[PDB]
Amino acid sequence: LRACGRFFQKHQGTCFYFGELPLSLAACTKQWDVVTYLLENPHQPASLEATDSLGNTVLHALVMIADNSPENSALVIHMYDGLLQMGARLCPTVQ
Amino acid sequence: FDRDRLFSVVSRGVPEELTGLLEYLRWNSKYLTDSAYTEGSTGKTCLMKAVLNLQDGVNACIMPLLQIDKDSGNPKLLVNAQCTDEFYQGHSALHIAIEKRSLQCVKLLVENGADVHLRACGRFFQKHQGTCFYFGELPLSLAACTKQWDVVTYLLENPHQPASLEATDSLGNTVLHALVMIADNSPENSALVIHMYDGLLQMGARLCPTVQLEEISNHQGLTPLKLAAKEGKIEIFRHILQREFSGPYQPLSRKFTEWCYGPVRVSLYDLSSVDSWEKNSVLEIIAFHCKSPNRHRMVVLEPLNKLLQEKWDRLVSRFFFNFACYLVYMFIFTVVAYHQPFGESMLLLGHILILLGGIYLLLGQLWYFWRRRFMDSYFEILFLLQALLTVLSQVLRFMETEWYLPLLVLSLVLGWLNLLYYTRGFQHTGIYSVMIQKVILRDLLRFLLVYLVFLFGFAVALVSLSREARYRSILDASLELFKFTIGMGELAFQEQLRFRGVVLLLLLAYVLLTYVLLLNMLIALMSETVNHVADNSWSIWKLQKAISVLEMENGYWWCRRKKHREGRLLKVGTRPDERWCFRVEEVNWAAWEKTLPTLSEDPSGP
Amino acid sequence: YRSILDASLELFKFTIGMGELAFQEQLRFRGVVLLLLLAYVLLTYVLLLNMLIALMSETVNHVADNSWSIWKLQKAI
Amino acid sequence: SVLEMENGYWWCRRKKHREGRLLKVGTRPDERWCFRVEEVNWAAWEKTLPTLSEDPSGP
Numbered sequence: 037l038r039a040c041g042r043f044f045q046k047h048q049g050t051c052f053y054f055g056e057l058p059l060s061l062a063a064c065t066k067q068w069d070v071v072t073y074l075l076e077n078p079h080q081p082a083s084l085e086a087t088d089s090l091g092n093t094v095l096h097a098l099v100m101i102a103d104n105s106p107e108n109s110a111l112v113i114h115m116y117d118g119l120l121q122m123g124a125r126l127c128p129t130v131q
Numbered sequence: 132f133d134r135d136r137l138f139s140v141v142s143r144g145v146p147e148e149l150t151g152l153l154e155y156l157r158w159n160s161k162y163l164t165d166s167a168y169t170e171g172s173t174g175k176t177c178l179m180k181a182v183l184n185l186q187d188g189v190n191a192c193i194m195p196l197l198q199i200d201k202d203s204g205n206p207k208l209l210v211n212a213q214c215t216d217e218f219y220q221g222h223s224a225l226h227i228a229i230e231k232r233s234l235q236c237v238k239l240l241v242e243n244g245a246d247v248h249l250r251a252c253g254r255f256f257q258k259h260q261g262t263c264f265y266f267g268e269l270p271l272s273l274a275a276c277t278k279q280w281d282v283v284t285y286l287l288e289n290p291h292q293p294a295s296l297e298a299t300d301s302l303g304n305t306v307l308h309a310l311v312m313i314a315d316n317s318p319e320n321s322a323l324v325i326h327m328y329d330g331l332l333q334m335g336a337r338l339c340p341t342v343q344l345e346e347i348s349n350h351q352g353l354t355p356l357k358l359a360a361k362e363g364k365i366e367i368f369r370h371i372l373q374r375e376f377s378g379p380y381q382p383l384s385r386k387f388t389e390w391c392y393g394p395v396r397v398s399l400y401d402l403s404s405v406d407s408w409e410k411n412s413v414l415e416i417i418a419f420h421c422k423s424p425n426r427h428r429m430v431v432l433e434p435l436n437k438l439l440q441e442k443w444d445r446l447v448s449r450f451f452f453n454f455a456c457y458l459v460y461m462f463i464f465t466v467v468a469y470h471q472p473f474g475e476s477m478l479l480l481g482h483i484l485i486l487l488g489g490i491y492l493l494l495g496q497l498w499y500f501w502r503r504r505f506m507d508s509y510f511e512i513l514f515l516l517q518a519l520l521t522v523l524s525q526v527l528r529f530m531e532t533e534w535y536l537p538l539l540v541l542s543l544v545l546g547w548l549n550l551l552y553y554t555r556g557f558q559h560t561g562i563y564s565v566m567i568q569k570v571i572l573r574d575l576l577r578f579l580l581v582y583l584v585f586l587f588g589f590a591v592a593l594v595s596l597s598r599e600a601r602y603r604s605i606l607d608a609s610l611e612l613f614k615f616t617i618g619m620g621e622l623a624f625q626e627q628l629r630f631r632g633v634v635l636l637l638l639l640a641y642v643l644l645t646y647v648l649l650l651n652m653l654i655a656l657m658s659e660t661v662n663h664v665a666d667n668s669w670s671i672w673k674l675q676k677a678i679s680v681l682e683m684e685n686g687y688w689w690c691r692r693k694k695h696r697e698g699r700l701l702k703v704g705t706r707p708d709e710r711w712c713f714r715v716e717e718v719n720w721a722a723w724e725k726t727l728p729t730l731s732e733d734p735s736g737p
Numbered sequence: 738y739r740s741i742l743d744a745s746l747e748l749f750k751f752t753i754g755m756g757e758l759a760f761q762e763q764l765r766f767r768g769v770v771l772l773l774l775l776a777y778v779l780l781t782y783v784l785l786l787n788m789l790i791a792l793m794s795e796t797v798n799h800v801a802d803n804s805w806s807i808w809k810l811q812k813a814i
Numbered sequence: 815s816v817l818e819m820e821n822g823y824w825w826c827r828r829k830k831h832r833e834g835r836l837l838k839v840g841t842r843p844d845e846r847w848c849f850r851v852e853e854v855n856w857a858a859w860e861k862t863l864p865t866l867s868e869d870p871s872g873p
């Protein structure tokens with residue numbers, strides 16, 4: 037479900053861009069339990085190669101939120117490596 | 132019995148040694164609070180002498196002394212007796228019981244009807260320089276300014292005496308004012324003052340829940356926040372400005388949260404007694420009333436930096452319009468000063484224009500100094516003096532004086548200096564200007580005094596040696612000397628002078644002394660450059676831009692613009708509590724734990 | 738000093754070190770012109786001092802790894 | 815500079831005025847000349863000390 041509102045688009049002031057998707061919102065808020073559940077649940081697949089209106093996947097949207105802060109960088113690196121390892125086993129064919 | 136033996140036995144603490152004291156007081160019918168039992172110098176009684184000499188918190192002879200006073204029929208109670216010397220006036224035994232940090236004797240003393248609202252108004256207790264300790268002239272204020280919190284919680288909540296939180300002393304200071312007054316910017320003093328401030332605020336939330344203790348004004352007329360800003364105490368002022376409380380103390384907080392959404396968070400700071408819409412604001416008190424040297428750090432804090440930046444972004448068009456008006460005035464001034472005796476008509480119109488502009492600037496600076504009756508009035512006195520010189524020059528022109536042309540071009544030159552005032556609009560030149568003034572002003576003025584003294588000394592020596600042939604006046608000799616500084620000085624071996632080697636040695640010694648003088652000023656400015664912190668200069672630039680913002684809001688002397696209020700009326704809770712809250716957005720990537728109440732469920736833009 | 742060109746040239750010659758200031762007797766306003774030249778010499782001296790310690794303050798607050806990185810960026814372009 | 819100004823000039827030699835005051839510091843009584851220094855300390859609420867005088871007084 038695409039959250040395409042003005043609060044969610046990337047611009048200056050009163051915005052929070054995360055990738056307009058529930059998996060991207062779960063990755064850009066450091067959950068990894070909602071992430072591992074949305075990725076692996078019998079009801080809904082919540083694939084890793086979904087894009088939003090800017091064409092950004094969840095890896096793009098983790099790059100987009102990345103500040104060069106000490107804690108933001110650790111968050112982004114953790115979620116980047118975790119989703120890479122999980123895409124190695126959910127959709128092992130695609131890069 | 133006598134007072135000397137009583138002081139001895141009450142210092143020892145033995146209660147058995149005062150056995151016939153009640154009998155002597157009955158047979159003599161003399162009360163214990165007379166001049167025959169108080170010391171002649173300071174007027175302290177035997178009870179004060181007892182409570183001075185405490186043995187691990189308790190004195191054995193302090194209860195019978197109160198007992199045999201009740202048996203003595205004293206109209207004025209012994210415990211309420213205070214000192215009479217002007218140095219120590221108003222000091223009672225309750226103040227000594229609090230100062231010695233003993234809750235046991237405090238309880239034992241308030242059970243016998245110790246009046247807890249006893250003003251210690253002596254010279255030792257008033258605020259001045261040297262041998263003083265100001266705490267607020269009250270026992271609750273003394274218990275708060277000495278970090279007890281047990282005497283405080285007992286005096287506030289005991290059945291005998293209420294010891295209310297809204298009591299004032301002779302300066303009108305409550306206990307919150309008196310905690311602001313004692314606040315140093317030390318690391319431990321600030322923690323002490325912040326702890327007692329928050330503790331007494333929370334306790335006044337439940338003892339007198341109706342009144343707001345932050346709104347009480349002293350005899351000078353300041354709330355404790357304005358007294359924190361006026362006295363230049365940075366850390367307690369910062370802690371009051373951004374105060375967050377979680378629980379039932381939420382209506383006592385000043386910093387609320389409106390909504391959170393992941394890392395994005397909007398906070399709300401109430402602009403009560405801060406925003407410049409009211410008369411005695413905190414911004415105006417930091418700018419035009421505070422004289423402490425850290426007043427430039429007070430405009431840097433979190434709810435104030437964003438507020439002054441928003442005001443500046445709204446007023447920058449008016450700032451540059453004032454700059455453009457002054458620049459156009461200086462262009463017509465320099466054109467009028469160039470063309471000096473369609474042509475004569477335009478020249479008379481230009482004279483009329485610069486006279487009207489001088490009158491305009493003169494009235495503006497006069498209104499400025501009428502309202503505000505260095506570095507704050509540094510350019511204001513310059514603008515005033517330049518407008519004064521311009522109107523005096525046009526008056527002397529109308530008087531057909533020959534000396535009108537020196538006063539005109541001086542008013543021209545000074546005008547082109549006053550344009551430097553408009554460097555504070557841009558960050559780099561403004562910060563650099565502030566840094567330049569602080570680094571170079573004192574050093575350059577002292578160097579100039581040295582150079583002038585040495586110049587005229589060597590000029591008199593050069594005239595005296597060059598008078599007798601084998602530099603005529605001090606003016607021409609000092610000019611020939613000063614030409615060594617600009618790099619056009621001429622030194623040569625003269626043969627028509629009798630004293631010619633010593634004049635050559637005098638010129639060489641002056642060249643060497645001027646070189647060491649320039650070296651002295653160079654490495655003095657270099658040493659000031661190395662020992663320089665750029666955050667200090669950035670803060671002083673923010674203070675300059677804040678004073679510019681505060682003066683642009685008033686409007687001109689002809690039209691006074693109505694001050695548009697900042698923030699929006701928001702329901703922060705149920706006291707409903709409707710405050711004007713300035714909104715500050717922030718992003719925090721380390722705050723995933725969310726233990727907070729938020730005023731609004733759904734995020735919204737400004 | 739007749740035109741603004743020649744007067745500004747005589748003024749600017751104080752910067753290069755060949756400026757000539759002298760007490761003139763053929764000028765009515767001669768003391769105030771001497772005071773104007775002296776005030777200009779002082780103002781130019783404070784201006785050069787201002788630029789000197791501004792560059793000195795920028796030199797002290799300077800990190801050479803930043804300059805090395807920008808040089809690597811220039812060489813990379 | 816302070817030490818040389820106290821001697822006075824070569825023509826008149828001023829008598830050196832003593833600093834401090836004769837105070838009883840204890841029983842050795844022990845009477846010394848003690849220069850008085852005031853201070854404020856906001857971290858010393860623990861009071862394990864003997865004091866020479868009970869009541870505060872200005873200089």
Ligand SMILES: COc1cc(/C=C/C(=O)N2CCC=CC2=O)cc(OC)c1OC
Nearest residue numbers: 551553554560564567568780783784787
């Ligand atoms: C009073 O302190 C001084 C400041 C300055 C700064 C000049 C400047 O940066 N300007 C002016 C022209 C407009 C922008 C701009 O960039 C220069 C001074 O030297 C005469 C000052 O006096 C010490």
